[PDB]
Structure formats: C-alpha cells, structure tokens
C-alpha cells in the first residue's frame, strides 16, 4: 500500500502495461474510462498516469480479492476486453485492456498469484 514510489522504481514487476480503469463514481465530463499505467509489484497493484510518473495515483493489495472477465462493464464492442478485481467487502476495481487476449493475460497473471 501507501509509500509514494516511482513507476520505474517498483520492485519485481510481474506485469505492467496500460489499462483503462473505470472511474469510482458517476459525474465524469468526457469519460468513465481513464488510461492508466498499471503494474503488479509483488502483491500490490499500482496505477499511474504514465510509466514514468514519480508517484502512483493509487494502489491496492490483491489479498482476499478474486478476479474475472466481466463483459457487462461496457455496452460497446470493447466489453470483451473488460475485467475486474473484486470481493464482497472491498472496493471493486474495473478495467478494459487492449484486446481480449490481454485482458485474459492480466486475469491469468493475477490468478496464478491469488494461489
């Protein structure tokens, strides 16, 4: 979780790439979907503006969370790229990747670690 680290300074990145991350709530001029540089650092999921920011917009431990494809999070044709990191008591994080294969790789990689 908390200490401000730089994207390029993160330890053991298991996977990283751009994703669109869904906004928390509803009044969002232009967009509910925002391009973020995301990285899995060990068991913490970090997300940034760009792959060279010196500070995360936020982060979260993946402890207790499950992860699945969810093709309801959009109405457009990009729905096939959508996945989420979710749990009954936790903040749900939702994303769209670049292609179904990429969403599946992210989910596959987050899962191989949820073991």
From Swiss-Prot:
Inducing factors: By IL-6 in myeloid cells.
Chain ranges of the PH domain: 12-115
GO cellular component: cytoplasm; cytosol; nucleoplasm; plasma membrane
Entry comment on modification after translation: In case of infection with Y.pseudotuberculosis, dephosphorylated by bacterial phosphatase yopH.
Keywords: B-cell activation, Cytoplasm, Phosphoprotein, SH3 domain
GO biological process terms held by the UniProt record: B cell activation; negative regulation of cell population proliferation
Tissue: Expressed in kidney, lung, liver, spleen, bone marrow and testis. Present in T-cells, B-cells, and all cells of the myelomonocytic lineage. Present in all brain regions, with highest levels in neurons from the Purkinje cell layer, hippocampal gyrus, cortex and substantia nigra (at protein level).
Disulfide cysteine pairs (residue numbers): none
Outcome of gene disruption: Mice are healthy and do not display any obvious abnormality. They have normal T-cell, platelet and macrophage function, but show reduced levels of spontaneous immunoglobulins in the serum, and defects in B-cell proliferation.
Modified residues (Phosphotyrosine): 47, 93
Function (record text): May be involved in B-cell and macrophage adhesion processes. In B-cells, may act by coupling the B-cell receptor (BCR) to integrin activation. May play a role in src signaling pathway.
Complex formation: Interacts with LAT, GRB2, PTK2B and PRAM1. Homodimer. Interacts with FYB1, which is required for SKAP2 protein stability. Interacts with PTPNS1. Part of a complex consisting of SKAP2, FYB1 and PTPNS1. Part of a complex consisting of SKAP2, FYB1 and PIRB. May interact with actin. May interact with FYN, HCK and LYN. Interacts with FASLG.
Record remark on domains: The SH3 domain interacts with FYB1 and PTK2B.
Protein known as: Src kinase-associated phosphoprotein 2
Gene for this chain: Skap2
Shown residues in whole-protein numbering: 105 to 219 of 358
């Amino acid at each position: 979780q908390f200490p401000p680290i730089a994207a390029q300074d993160l330890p053991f990145v298991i996977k990283a790439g751009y994703l669109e991350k869904r906004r928390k709530d509803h009044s969002f001029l232009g967009f509910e979907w925002q391009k973020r540089w995301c990285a899995l650092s060990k068991t913490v999921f970090y997300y940034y503006g760009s792959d060279k920011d010196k500070q995360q917009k936020g982060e979260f431990a993946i402890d207790g969370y499950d992860v699945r494809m969810n093709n309801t999070l959009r109405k457009d044709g990009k729905k096939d790229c959508c996945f989420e990191i979710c749990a009954p008591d936790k903040r749900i994080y939702q994303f769209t990747a670049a292609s179904p294969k990429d969403a599946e790789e992210w989910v596959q990689q987050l899962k191989f670690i949820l073991q």
